[PDB]
């Protein structure tokens, strides 16, 4: 019983080292290995500073706020090939920390416990197509997670606002913090942002408001695994703000707070809001779901670990994670719908609705 | 349901060694602490040493001559060991962890949970 | 090290009195304080955690503190008789350190 699993950590951090060296391999000893197009385009689009426009780039376009413009600058200097070498150890340093950042909130520590978790959950669908592009999901949730773990009012609102003045996305955490009564950290935070955005307008030729102007003025692919998406796929249409999407994000709401509810610690808490934020997001790829690590290190290691659905869901959860069942149906995705194909782009909003509604039922019943 | 009993006390002699043991029922050591705290007849308590099992052992106060580990998973075991203070009465609690990170890594306890064990009666 | 202090003045046990105990610590041990109660030859039991979290099962204790780096108990009532010794503690140097505190009735 417990006997095989105490013996498979006990060596942590071979597999950890032995996994990445299979890693650096694959992007260097295969055809469209190691392209890069995301940090190719976060690279080379603050070159055109001081002459000509950010905007009108192409690459065979970049849609970044100007902070994130700023920041890139200082990377042009450096050799691409470097800059490529660097980023995929700084993917897995941060994968690492992010693992001992649960630990840690847990509420105890194992390093060679975490180096199996990193080994293993490496080569998951979302964290496996992550720097496939090189994108940054991966630093952000770090940065989150130092924020949640911090005491002061300055760390965690400097550090909430830096990583949203990037991207836009990570300011949902704002709902889980206004919930676990943390006031003043959502008014530190939006005067960071409002200094970034400041600075980004300052920086560059005022094309900050035009982006924000542009913004506000594929969705059907298979890839996209929210409601919209799905909603789209299954009519044939685009779906918008159709009336049967406010009815379909509308009891996803209910179902979430209920869930919220169920749950009263920190971990499961920001799992349940980024589990929200993920499913009303109108564009959400498959690589915007990297935050299924802690809720799954929650699962097996939090306090319901002495349930039998608890472990049937962490079970199936990392099994249908593993498998990729949206990658494999990309093979028979039109290039713009039989219904046996058209049906099985709804697994994971399926999958994550059965979650909430069973974390909700448990919770009712528990009073 | 939780329990912990204690074993090893005696009548050593002034110049020695001895052992203790305080087994448990009802829970796994991988997610809590073990503390030992001693109390000299006719005076207050005295905290001796703490563990994490899960990492390490630390804090032995200023008397260091204990060994204090612990055999997780294998019959719920944690065993002291002294290399000689005074006569006292020993018992073992619970305890759990908070971590917080303020620029660095700084943690505290929060309070041994009311699952004590009864005392030893060892004298030198 | 971080030092305590109490006032070990306690008496009369008068069912209903009130009840203030103070822990006068040193330096800065934040809000990892913890009391507890003990009995003659009986193992002590846990009564408030946190230095302001309150246990569950403890109907005759329901009481907080300050937090203030000085802390108080109010015991309102002391109908069973209460009659035990208290204490408080550290755990924030990495070293736990104790205290005294006794209650005696009429005479």
């Known amino acids: 019983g417990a006997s095989a699993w105490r013996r498979v950590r006990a060596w942590g951090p071979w597999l950890l080292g032995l996994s990445v060296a299979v890693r650096l391999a694959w992007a260097y000893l295969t055809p469209h290995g190691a392209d890069l197009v995301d940090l190719h385009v976060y690279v080379s689009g603050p070159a055109t500073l001081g002459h000509g426009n950010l905007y009108e780039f192409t690459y065979p376009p970049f849609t970044y706020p100007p902070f994130a413009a700023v920041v890139f600058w200082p990377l042009h200097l450096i050799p691409f090939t470097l800059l490529g070498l660097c980023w995929i150890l700084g993917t897995i340093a941060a994968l690492y920390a992010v693992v001992r950042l649960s630990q840690r909130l847990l509420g105890f520590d194992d390093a060679r416990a975490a180096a199996v978790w990193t080994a293993v959950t490496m080569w998951t669908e979302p964290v496996r197509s992550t720097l496939d592009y090189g994108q940054i999901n991966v630093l952000l949730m770090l940065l989150i997670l130092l924020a949640v773990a911090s005491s002061r009012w300055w760390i965690s609102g400097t550090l909430i606002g830096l990583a949203g003045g990037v991207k836009l996305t990570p300011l949902v955490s704002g709902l889980y913090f206004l919930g676990a009564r943390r006031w003043t950290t959502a008014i530190w935070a939006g005067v960071v942002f409002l200094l970034t955005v400041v600075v980004g307008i300052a920086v560059v030729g005022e094309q900050g408001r035009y982006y924000f102007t542009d913004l506000l003025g594929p969705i059907a692919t298979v890839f996209n695994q929210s409601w919209r998406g799905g909603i789209s796929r299954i009519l044939g249409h685009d779906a918008g703000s159709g009336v049967l999407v406010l009815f379909a994000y509308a009891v996803t709401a209910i179902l979430a707070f209920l869930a919220w509810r169920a749950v009263n610690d920190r971990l499961g808490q920001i799992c349940v809001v980024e589990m929200f934020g993920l499913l009303i997001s109108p564009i959400s790829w498959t690589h915007h779901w990297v935050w299924m690590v802690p809720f799954m290190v929650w699962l097996l290691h939090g306090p319901w670990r002495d349930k039998v659905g608890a472990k049937v869901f962490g079970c199936g959860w990392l099994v249908l994670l593993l498998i990729g069942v949206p990658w494999l149906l990309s093979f028979a995705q039109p290039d713009i719908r039989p219904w046996p194909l058209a049906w099985a782009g709804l697994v994971d909003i399926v999958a994550a609705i059965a979650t909430l509604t069973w974390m909700a039922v448990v919770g009712r019943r528990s009073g | 349901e939780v329990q912990l009993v204690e074993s090893g006390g005696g009548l050593v002699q002034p110049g020695g060694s001895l052992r203790l043991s305080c087994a448990a029922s009802?829970?796994?050591?991988?997610?809590?602490?073990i503390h030992w705290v001693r109390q000299a007849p006719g005076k207050g308590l005295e905290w001796v040493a703490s563990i994490s099992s899960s990492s390490g052992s630390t804090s032995y106060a200023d008397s260091v001559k204990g060994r204090f580990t612990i055999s997780a998973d294998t019959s719920k075991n944690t065993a002291y060991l002294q290399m000689n203070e005074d006569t006292a009465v020993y018992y073992c609690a619970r305890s759990q962890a908070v971590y917080y990170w303020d620029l660095w890594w700084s943690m505290y306890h929060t309070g041994f949970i009311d699952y004590w064990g009864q005392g030893t009666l060892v004298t030198v | 090290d971080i030092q305590m202090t109490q006032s070990p003045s306690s008496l009369s046990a008068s069912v209903g009195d009130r009840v203030t105990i103070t822990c006068r610590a040193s330096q800065s041990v934040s809000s990892a304080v913890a009391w507890y109660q003990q009995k003659p030859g009986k193992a002590p039991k846990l009564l408030i955690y946190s230095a302001s979290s309150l246990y569950s099962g403890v109907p005759s204790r329901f009481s907080g503190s300050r937090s203030g780096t000085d802390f108080t108990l109010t015991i309102s009532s002391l109908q069973p008789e209460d009659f035990a010794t208290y204490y408080c503690?550290?755990?924030?140097?990495?070293?736990?350190?104790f205290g005294q505190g006794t209650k005696v009735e009429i005479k």
């Open positions: 503690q550290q755990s924030s140097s990495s070293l736990i350190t």
């Open positions: 009802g829970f796994n050591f991988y997610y809590y602490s």
